Amino acid sequence: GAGYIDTDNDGSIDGDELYIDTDNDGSIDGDELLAMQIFVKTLTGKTITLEVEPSDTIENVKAKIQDKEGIPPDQQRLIFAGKQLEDGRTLSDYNIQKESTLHLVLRLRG
Numbered sequence: 001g002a003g004y005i006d007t008d009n010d011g012s013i014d015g016d017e018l019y020i021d022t023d024n025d026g027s028i029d030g031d032e033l034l035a036m037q038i039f040v041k042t043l044t045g046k047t048i049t050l051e052v053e054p055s056d057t058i059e060n061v062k063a064k065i066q067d068k069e070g071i072p073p074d075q076q077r078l079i080f081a082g083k084q085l086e087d088g089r090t091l092s093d094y095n096i097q098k099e100s101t102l103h104l105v106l107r108l109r110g
C-alpha cells in the first residue's frame with residue numbers, strides 16, 4: 001500500500017509525502033521509511049510498479065511479481081542495465097534505487 005500523508009501539516013500534499021506500507025498493516029515503521037517504488041517492464045508491454053525496500057532480495061522481488069501478475073518465479077529472469085540479477089542478492093547490492101527500471105524476460109533452461 002502507498003498513500004500521501006501530510007507530515008508537516010502544510011495543508012498542501014507534497015512529493016516528499018508519498019509513504020509506502022510494504023506489510024499492508026495500516027502503518028509505516030522505521031524500516032519502511034526507506035521503501036521505494038521500482039518499475040518492471042514486462043514483455044506484454046505492461047509495466048508493473050513494485051513496492052520494495054533496498055534490503056529485498058531478487059527472490060523477494062520475483063515473489064512480488066507473482067503476487068501481482070500470476071507469473072511463477074521459475075519463469076522469471078530479471079535484468080538491470082545489462083547485469084542479470086542473482087536471486088540471493090539484494091536491490092542494494094545492485095545499487096537499484098527509487099524509480100529504477102528492471103526488465104522482466106522469460107527464463108528458459110537448457
Ligand SMILES: [Gd]
Binds near residue numbers: 007013
Ligand atoms: Gd505538506
Ligand SMILES: [Gd]
Binds near residue numbers: 023024032
Ligand atoms: Gd507497515
